[model samples]
Target: SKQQRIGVIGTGAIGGFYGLMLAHAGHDVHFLLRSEFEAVNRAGLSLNSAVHGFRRLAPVQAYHSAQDMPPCDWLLVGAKTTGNHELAPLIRAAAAPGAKVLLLQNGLGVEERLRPLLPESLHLLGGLCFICVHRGEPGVIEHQAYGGVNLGYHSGPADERRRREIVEEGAALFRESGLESTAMPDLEQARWQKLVWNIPYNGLSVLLKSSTAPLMANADSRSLIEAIMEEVIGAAGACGFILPEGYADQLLAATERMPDYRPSMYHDFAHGRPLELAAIYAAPLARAAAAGYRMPRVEALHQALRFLEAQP
Candidate 1:
């Protein structure tokens, strides 16, 4: 059986690359885009990537808003979590019963924010991406490096539907188009696992005007990253989430793997975009603090980020 139809909202770097891969694989992918639609209409979606090479293709369907989209089987929700409130209406309206909403985002705690608005029958899939893709132009996406996406489904119980769906649709699409993906039993753990990288690398890179290599090379910055990572590990454990072995070593190895890569947070700060302090740092710090953990270094980083973010 062919899973013919899937809808992708937000044709930014994340959605654009995945959408193009799915379309190239013969899946009917509808893109709910903004200006990218006009750009796509004028030219096409061009992806120049490292893991995958150059390719251009028009999506199966393009709509500016969800109201214009037809019902879809899988809806890949890639909007920034900061836009959660404004996008709530569109997300609720577009998805139907049995339609899986795969959320490709960072940070934690989107479930609480969306639970009230989303229907119970709809499956929520968590997506954590490590690959780097950029929008060089409006519709032009640059796939910069090697990384994989981890997919997990949430059902208040350990439902493997999301994992199975990833193994089915997500894996095939990655394989066909030369992308990488993993289906994890504990999707939430993967989300937190990725966060272990973000809390230090994402913020420190931006704060230092540097990339992953230098951030890890500096003895002081490297020590700071490790300490903050410990807090993040503790915070996740406080939430009853278990930590995988070699977590610290995994964070350390990123320098060698993606030394020159600039994190999204660094990109945001560079362009004078507001930081995701609350979602990415402050919120997690508070979670640990509430759990009676005094993460002094994390607390300091959060304060510094908040101050920098507040500046005009």
Candidate 2:
């Protein structure tokens, strides 16, 4: 694999974990952190990964500000969607000439929202992780299960050799870092498929204040979960992305097998942190409406979440 300079914008669970792996893979990884800058700079990243067990990447290059970090070949922006307003400028500053900025985040329409803020000459990629990982302390990450990613360019076909090479390189890099990764040819379709899972689980988790197990244990909640996912599928189809038939069933079965997982939004709400309302819910909801479809359940959940977010 080619050696590259990588800058990770967020030092949270997702960003920090992936950054640590890239650094361990011999890339020049520069971490742009906020609160944990001093701790990570002193003690480095303590990763308790399920795949790699326990490992430490010390003497890490940690920076508090993006300006201090040099431009990178790949700028991985894993910050929460709620902070994108503040994070956009930082990400733009850290992106080198012709660098690829991978948005390792959740939600729909993120690339569209972020593209204008970044350089047009640069490559913008969308990526999603299927992992159960969390951060307990400033410089520590705990990985439980499912460490893999689906990555592809923001828009366009992967037919060109250069684009294909780019995708392959990214996939190979993550694989070398001990994570399963695939170069998805169609990013939009991938987003919709992931949404089939995210729309139901993330929203229901916060609204019900429950985990996956409880949601699955009750018949009504389980049925509602499938209904939400089916609505997502219909919305995707209306938007011209035809997800596979019975995709909702597949996701339902998969979630049933998953451990008692607490979705990310629920975790944020429980901790009194801001939720990712726009990207995960509002954007997709608006898209569905524009396509002449109505998802009452999802819209209801969205309104409820908004109401909850407004509480003092």
Candidate 3:
């Protein structure tokens, strides 16, 4: 139904892109954003996409808090995992009994924090967004490429049914807007496999402040990238994710596809915004440690980055 409202809680580049597209598609989309809403109201959300070209319009409904929103059928969360503590109030205010909340972020460990507010009864969908996007200004977003989304659930019988429904409903909307999507059978593997791209490319880019191609093309940097991949691959193994043969080759090819893309981690660092180091790096690194794996490279890089975040 056109009246079926969709609530988007995060206002980052990825969230903003989908939210605007869904809004444009005649869905009643509510963006629970403060700053961007003001900017959009003043200057509008500028969308530079290969699929649609450069577009701009007045910002949509922008709110600073979730309590201001009416109940929604689905809530799309693309906030930084590091923002977990801050999400408590938003989750409490926005989530309804039957509403499905789909997470569109870098890594796992979402349920661990939100389970206290939302029991297993609340439907939650895990989403892996493959698109590379960046926020130019407050509401301006640039989509560098069209990448498919891998989305599903790992828990709750209710969540599974909701996942199917969302895939059926949301997939087309995403595709029409140039973002393809697939609901994978092995969502656990999908999450970790997606990590194969993020853990190395995202982190290394931030450390070097370079885009994807240079990071992969330079001999020394390329070797470093592969080394980082091995740590993540090893961790994925410990987590029981069965990746395909020549998985490294596949990941390298994917990075080449977005040679000029700037990963969100590097984007965050360059933009002076907070990063999801803990969610993307710390979560798996710690888990690997518990599993008795020695991922020295992952450990060392994460430690340095964490220290960087701690610096005033």
Best by lDDT: 2
The candidate that achieves the highest TM-score relative to the unseen native structure: 2
Off by over 4 Å in 2: 155-159
RMSD of 2: 1.9
Determine the C-alpha RMSD for candidate 3 after optimal superposition of all C-alphas.
2.3
In the range 43-93, model 1's lDDT, one tens digit per residue, is 768888776678888534778888988777777877667676676567666
In candidate 2, which residue pairs clash? Answer: none
lDDT of 2: 0.86
C-alpha local distance difference test of each model = 0.74, 0.86, 0.74
Per-residue lDDT for 167-246 in model 3, tens only? 55656656655567887776667777877888888777777778888887798988888888888888889877767888
The true-versus-predicted C-alpha distance at residue 307 of model 2, in Å, is 1.0
Q: Over all chains combined, what TM-score does candidate 3 have?
A: 0.90
| 1-312: candidate 2 lDDT, tens digit per residue | 889999999878889889988898889999999667878899888888666889888888989989999999888887888888777688878888878888888989888788777767778888888877887676788887787889988833344777768877888889998789999988888888888888889989988989999999999999999889888899999999999878888878878777788888888898888999898889889999999999999999999999998987
Better of 1 and 2 by lDDT: 2
Reference-based TM-score of each model: 0.90, 0.95, 0.90
Clashes in model 1: which pairs?
none
